Design a binder for this molecule. Structure first.
Ligand SMILES: C=CC1=C(C)c2cc3[nH]c(cc4nc(cc5[nH]c(cc1n2)c(C)c5C=C)C(C)=C4CCC(=O)O)c(CCC(=O)O)c3C
Length: 293
């Protein structure tokens, strides 16, 4: 019988409490700048937010961000999550300092903080995820494969209640970070300015000269002479005519991409959660720059 998960505000907490958590994550992002050849922790925190939310199944309300179940071995041991231990370790001192925040609130807030501090759009964020027990952890295998085509992508994301525009917008997060051969069997960045959130993913898809190559793990990926790559699922966005139209739209309208990403990413992070009518409004956190910090 599917589970209603009702958001429950951490007792007595308000916007200022969560802004302090934001700020601690943001200051640590600035301090621990050497990680991953000076990419920093921003991208891995966005990937962590996505992987902890992307297990959701709309059919039975299992998985999703609510329960914070990545803290249990079945999930941090998911082969699809290889590498995310670095993001968890980053967040450990944050949780120690703010032990009142739930695990799902912390994982999701880490992704919002990373996007914003990397000059991305504001992402409204709601509190109130509540930790759930070990037997609520979803089985491995709910996150998407990278070696597939547009039809796979489209069908996959129906389980997360995402439409074509939402899918294409969310995939623009691949402007950030890179693939690492030891984690995923893919190697290389999608672009150049990979710790700055921009619409570069879409520009690179359209404007680079891509060649289908095998990497050192014997997997196919698309490579450019600029030193960028696209996964088969990324490249599928220009193979499918419906996705291609949307790629072109975001390549030509930075503001539109930002607005659509913000909405889709909030939705991703909120899937599965019931917000009571009297819950607080979503919070829009100030960046460190906006605060003079
Ligand atoms: C078809 C859909 C998707 C597939 C197959 C997928 C593929 C990948 N995404 C990766 C990393 C990444 N994924 C990322 C955000 C997202 N990625 C998402 C959608 C997908 N992501 C969405 C949705 C995201 C958030 C909104 C980020 C930012 C990284 C880079 C992480 C890092 O450590 O640099 C990796 C590489 C992991 C590694 O360290 O080697 C793969 C294989």
């Amino acid at each position: 019988t599917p589970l209603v998960h009702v958001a429950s505000v951490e007792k007595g907490r308000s916007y200022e409490d969560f802004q302090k958590v934001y700020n601690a994550i943001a200051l640590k992002l600035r301090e621990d700048d050497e990680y991953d050849n000076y990419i920093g922790y921003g991208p891995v925190l966005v990937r962590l937010a996505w992987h902890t939310s992307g297990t959701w199944d709309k059919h039975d309300n299992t998985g999703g961000s609510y329960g914070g179940t990545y803290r249990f071995k079945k999930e941090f041991n998911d082969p699809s999550n290889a590498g995310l231990q670095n993001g968890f370790k980053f967040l450990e001192p944050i949780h120690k300092e703010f032990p009142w925040i739930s695990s799902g609130d912390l994982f999701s807030l880490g992704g919002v903080t990373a996007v914003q501090e990397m000059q991305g759009p504001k992402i409204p964020w709601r509190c109130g995820r509540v930790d759930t027990p070990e037997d609520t952890t979803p089985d491995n295998g709910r996150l998407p494969d990278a070696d597939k085509d547009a039809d796979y992508v489209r069908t996959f994301f129906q389980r997360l209640n995402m439409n074509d525009r939402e899918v294409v917008a969310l995939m623009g997060a691949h402007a950030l970070g890179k693939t690492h051969l030891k984690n995923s069997g893919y190697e290389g960045p999608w672009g150049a300015a990979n710790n700055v959130f921009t619409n570069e993913f879409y520009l690179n898809l359209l404007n680079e000269d891509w060649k289908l190559e095998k990497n050192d793990a014997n997997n196919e990926q698309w490579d450019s002479k600029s030193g960028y790559m696209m996964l088969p699922t990324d490249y599928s966005l220009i193979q499918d005519p419906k996705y291609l139209s949307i790629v072109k739209e975001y390549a030509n309208d930075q503001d539109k991409f930002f607005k659509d990403f913000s909405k889709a990413f909030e939705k991703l992070l909120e899937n599965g959660i019931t917000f009571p009518k009297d819950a607080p409004s979503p919070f829009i956190f100030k960046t460190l720059e906006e605060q003079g910090l």
